[PDB]
Amino acid sequence: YFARQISSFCSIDCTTILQLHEIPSLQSIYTLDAAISKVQVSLDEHFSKMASSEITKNLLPATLQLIDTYASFTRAYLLQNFNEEPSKEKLQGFAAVLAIGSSRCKANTLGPTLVQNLPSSVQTVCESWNNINTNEFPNIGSWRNAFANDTIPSESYISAVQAAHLGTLCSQSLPLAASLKHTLLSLVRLTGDLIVWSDEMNPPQVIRTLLPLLLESSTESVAEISSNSLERILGPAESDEFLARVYEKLITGCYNILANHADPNSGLDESILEECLQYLEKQLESSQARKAMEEFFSDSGELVQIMMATANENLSAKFCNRVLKFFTKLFQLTEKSPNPSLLHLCGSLAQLACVEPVRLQAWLTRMTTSPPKDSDQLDVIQENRQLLQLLTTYIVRENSQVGEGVCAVLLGTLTPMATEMLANGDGTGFPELMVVMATLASAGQGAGHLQLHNAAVDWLSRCKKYLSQKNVVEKLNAHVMILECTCHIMSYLADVTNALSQS
């Protein structure tokens, strides 16, 4: 029966949101609960008597897949239930949020906090979902006393399970999956039983199953049971392996919200993003979480994606500010207490050297340009500029692991921005841009700076050109932004010639 159910699930997507129509009718869910109860009781009996090999061999893979599939069904019943007063985009977002949302184990308030930040409607929906439970059903080993049934007990137990399913039918709110939860619970208990005996259990695979089943809100009935399964394979809830999986998954989820749920279409308030950026700084503090994030990001430029996601303009300048601190504290923590994990994140920023130049510029633009029209907080825009300068200085340092390519990449991209700050006469920001460009020639100490020398020669040329406007000349005798830009360019040329004389 398990096989049948699995195969029927071929149309079902394990890692994707299932349409509310693809959730199985209560019938299948309960035929299943029944089959499960039966195998369970029968095997208990057999084992106590013993006090089969291929039996477990087959049952375990078969059960493992159904748990993950029914986990998606529980989510589908909860997610699609969200009241429109919702776009799939919004829904995919709420999804990562409630997934991350863990209500058990060490995990992290990260979830609980993100779960909370999900508007009144969704909050109430999740609340009602958790409020319903698998109570009327007869719970574990009730067959110890033969389930109050003469001789063969299993049948009466299955009948009571069916009666509880029919009572859930009566419910008008989330009635079908009031039984999905109990099916999931029975499945997780049977899976823990199969894990008990070694059989051929795939430790890492089962570990992953239970990790996702736990650090989630939809699958909350078995969250404890999944934690028990992890204690079984990962070890104590305070064992490294267990915590290792918990926090790794947590970061993966946060990251998913940071890069694949940044768009407002996900319906996710900016609060979630800021809260888990704080959570990521917190993990950087915690050595183990720091090192996991480290392997992962020296592996994939994923930290670059955070700043690349910050390029999103829909995100407030507060996001920019928050992102800058995170990296600020990544570089500083490295300076205060150097360790390989930190070396590896700077090797990760070397991947930033290879990014979409337009996207990088679009990001640099959002960071430097200060429009009071949308950003009433120009002071926060200025803090953003300062933190970008700090990050550039950190990358240009000799002991930095970001490499020289990234510095040049940033330097080159800023050149057009600087030119625009002189072409459209954007005096505001131009001086800071110049400062940052300078740090790139700074990286140019032993090797480099050449680029900056040439670029500065060119900027001098351009500021000269503008001032040469005699209308503006008369205005000044009586614009001023362009004049001060030219003055700063001349001062930087003076500094460059001083450096050349020192050489």
3-state secondary structure 332-351: HHHHHCCCHHHHHHHHHHHH
The position carrying tokens 């089969």 is: 52
Smallest CA-to-CA distance from 417 within 463, 490, 366 is with: 366
For 86, counting Cβ atoms within 10 Å of its Cβ (0-12 exposed, 13-18 middle, 19+ buried), the class is middle
Q: Which residues contact 290 (CB under 8 A, 6 or more apart)?
A: 283, 284, 339, 341, 342
How far is C-alpha 400 from the chain's CA centre? 26
Distances from the Cα of 10 to the Cα of 7, 77, 213, 219, 355, angstroms: 5, 19, 21, 21, 38
Could you give the CA distance from residue 304 to residue 489 in angstroms, rounded to a whole number? 31
Distances from the Cα of 341 to the Cα of 240, 250, 252, 265, 306, angstroms: 17, 18, 17, 34, 18
- Helices (runs of H) and strands (runs of E) counted in the chain: 23, 0
Reduced DSSP (H G I as helix, E B as strand, rest coil) percent helix, strand, coil of the chain, to 5? 75, 0, 25
Print burial letters for 318-340: b (CB count within 10 Å at least 16), e (below 16).
bbbbbbbbbbbebbebbeeeeee
Residues 268 and 93 sit within 8 Å (Cβ to Cβ): yes
The position carrying tokens 């001023």 is: 480
3-class DSSP assignment, residue 202: coil
3-class DSSP assignment, residue 271: helix
Smallest CA-to-CA distance from 220 within 71, 332, 344, 79 is with: 71
Helix spans in 101-222 (H): 110-116, 120-131, 154-170, 177-196, 203-214
For 40, counting Cβ atoms within 10 Å of its Cβ (0-12 exposed, 13-18 middle, 19+ buried), the class is buried
Q: What is the CA radius of gyration of the chain?
A: 30
Residues 75 and 221 sit within 8 Å (Cβ to Cβ): no
Distances from the Cα of 347 to the Cα of 197, 303, 341, angstroms: 44, 11, 10
Distances from the Cα of 377 to the Cα of 139, 317, 373, 390, angstroms: 57, 9, 10, 20
Smallest CA-to-CA distance from 223 within 134, 125, 121 is with: 134
Resolution in A: 3.4
Print burial letters for 366-380: b (CB count within 10 Å at least 16), e (below 16).
bbbbbeeeebeeeee
Distances from the Cα of 271 to the Cα of 178, 259, 264, 307, 318, angstroms: 31, 15, 12, 17, 10
Could you give the CA distance from residue 350 to residue 344 in angstroms, rounded to a whole number? 10
